[PDB]
Amino acid sequence: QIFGDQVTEERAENARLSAFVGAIAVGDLVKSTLGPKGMDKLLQSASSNTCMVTNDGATILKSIPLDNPAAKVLVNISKVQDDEVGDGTTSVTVLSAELLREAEKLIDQSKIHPQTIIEGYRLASAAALDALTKAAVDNSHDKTMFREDLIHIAKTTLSSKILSQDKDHFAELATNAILRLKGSTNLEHIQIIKILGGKLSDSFLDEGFILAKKFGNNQPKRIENAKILIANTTLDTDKVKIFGTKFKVDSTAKLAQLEKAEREKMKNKIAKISKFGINTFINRQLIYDYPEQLFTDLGINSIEHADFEGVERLALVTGGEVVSTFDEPSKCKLGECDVIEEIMLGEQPFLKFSGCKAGEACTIVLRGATDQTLDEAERSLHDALSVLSQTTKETRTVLGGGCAEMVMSKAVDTEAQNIDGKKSLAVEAFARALRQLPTILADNAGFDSSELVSKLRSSIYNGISTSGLDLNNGTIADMRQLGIVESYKLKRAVVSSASEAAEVLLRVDNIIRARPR
Template sequence: MSQVNTIANVTDEVDGDEAVDQNISAGIALADVLRTTLGPNGRDKMLVGDGQVVLTNDGASIVDRIDIESPAAKLVSEVAHSQGGDIGDGATSAIVLSGALLREANELLEDGFHPTTIVNGYGEAATRARNRLPELATWENHDDETRRRIVETSITGRWDAERTAFLADLAVRGYQAARSTDGPRLENVTIHGIAGGGTADSKLLDGLVIDTDRSSTSVSDVPAPLPRRVEDANVAVVDDELTIQSPESTPQLSVEDTDALRRLQAFETGEYERYVDTLTTHNIDVLFCQKSIDDRLKALLAQAGILAFERTRQDEVHKLERATGASPIMRPGELNVGAVGHAHVVERRTLGASEFTLVRDSASTQVSLLLRGGTDHVVDETERIVVDAIDLLASFDARAGVVPGGGATEVALAADLRTWSRSIGDRTQIVVDAVADALETIPRTLARNAGHDPIDTLLELRHRHDDGDATAGLDVNTGDVADMYSRGIVAPVRLNERLIANATEAVTSILRIDGIIHVDEPVHEDGDDHDHQHAISGGFQSDSHGYPWAIGH
């Protein structure tokens, strides 16, 4: 997918107030791109490039697909990657909060505040808010119902209520199936999307599912018919190529007479038969090989009734080990009883337009989620939802507290910051109040995107919180200001902690920048200008004039 939008390209040498203005404008521009997607009723963005179309309101997905050329906007975009990668949710909220903090900072700068004063005030306010969060959270009696509510809150609005509940339950069951005594083992979950069918056709399977179209894994191509299904199968996994080994120092083998040729052929035949005899001695029914299998050996394996797969990816070798209990070996001669795995069934199946291999066993620690949808777009969006949901559940288990959603937590933190700021005796008080105003951007945006009056909604929320109702938030489906816990609208406390930390760190980094310098590309001694691009700061592409660098205080 090519990048399809450009955010605030900075190409001139600037410093001082002009640099600050350009940096703030770049960050605000990126936040404005995503602001309309925030919340359950956020509007989708259609991204078009290279003949492909992506329709999504997922903030992290949008940021991945737009061309961000400003170093300052790049810092803000990294908030989405950090939030989404670490938590699994909140990428859009983090960027929207960053944009709100930048807007407040811009007004403070116009009022004569020094950037250092704003940076210090933002830092103190963020610390206060993060310390207050545990007091707003509940920490006990969390079960799978709580997990389902967390996931439903995260994905509500991206699908209808019925499919939202179905996917939330599926994600929770998949996550729980991959847990062990040591906690969640996300590597034990394999997710495949299959176009064709309805979302409700998605299912959780014990064992491993290999997409033989997307993976390099393929069934050995032999004339003999191969079984589509093998039950009660003994499984061997070879972590190498299956062929006759030749000395690496001998690039070419010369045969001088027919006797030598016959001896060579007899040797090769004996080696191939030894491979097959070893496998049949251990009653191997299914063989997975990481690399290729010699054509002659393929035919012999098929004749022996062994279903052989070749070019299995290394990550799938590890998954097969967990799914079957087989220990990978380098050569068939190393096979022993302890290295043989077992599968209740190994089945080749066509789902949609793709070929799959299912390796299932009741004792497997590997599980697979097969996600269905009518079109590739629906499948891709469903896959993003489930992947994010599983990451979000892992974040919740790492710090098992929940806070009320619907903007309730942000309004409560804003009220606390305003109360606390009255005890501050210098200009920092105004900066802390600005952070409180920025936090309330979240409920205001939720109300606007849901079609409700943002001013009336915020006033009602403030009134309820002033009366001591710290769990009052906006139910975007009804427009009611209600107890979020009773409506099941909740989020992990760790999500809000990282949201505040990520947004504040990005904004304060931008505010510290007081100059942007353009450095010309050095000309190589051979006179060549080397017409290739260099990556700066995790993916920033310079133009043909050189490197834009940011200089901090």
């Protein structure tokens, strides 16, 4: 009797059924309740007079006691989706059940490795998110008025904050820190520089990626046509703690000979650096003068102590990679920038890059009179940038009514075209669950889903990518003419949660029952 105290392990045959059929039975509770035309469920207790009827997916799943240990996993997935947004919990559980329903066919009559099935979804979901981006529309129209509406909202976010001293200058910095990105609005694309000895109104916006530390001793302060390499290694005194070692040598000069041999091993790595044809090198650790002197003859400037976030933000602006090792010469993702200029602000030397390759980003340099003005401004600035970024990601919608679900199917079928051997059925199974979403929505409407979904697939396959399902008239019409749209953030949340839920469940060859609390 393994485990014990209500803990047990399911049989490999029953665990696959408990993770699939057992999870579908939980998804079947919210299956018929999906959509505005969905049905209702009954929740009855032992007293039987306390019961209630509701269509809420979060209420039905949490109220019903689940003895299936695999069903408790879907409860945790529902909590992750509820944290993102309070709507769409029903659609995630139903879509996850459709992925597991085809997964039973991806094992029995298929014989495909389960991790490859997940990797088959990771490649299919990537094409699904890309298809939603191409078909994405927005209510941002009349952007000329929308760009003006952002600077007024930024002023409202500055209330109660010490930045309220000047609203016009600070709201312009926050507004230009978003619209000028033309891409991801995450704070990783915005660098904050906190300095002393000035006024808050003297702050300015610079897209040149200003970083505090300098590079080189006798090296020049200007670099033209820079080639940036990103790597992490210790070129100066490795094994940071040498205390306790015993070096057996006949004389002290032989102890330094091993250090010279270590310096000879430095040329092995330095030679691989010169094979890349770079005038600039990035390192998180320090570098001793001898390997740095060899960089002077090769014309390589070394920026040191970039930490990690500073390295990742440098790879995004210059289009580089964070890899710390050299697998093979002339194979890598390299960045570059037009001009590297060293400036001085606040009695400290700074570095201002210029002309980064495909660079889209900004660096907000906050100049305060003390540490209290710098710390409270950065926390309040990110709150103002979060409100401005909320209007960019939200109110941006996509065509609904079965459209977006079928449009993703066409992109996944395109991914199912060029694919390796074992993932051909795994990618195709993902497109089947995408077509089951409008199928179930047509189930509760009272119409024929097999007729509407089949005609919807053949319609979008050749031309007419904007068509969708009309539940009112029971036919196929243009979604742009009917004005049926659904949020893009809701689509990304359901697809991401379905991939995370399938990542844990498909790897299951056995189920460990949780301990009751």
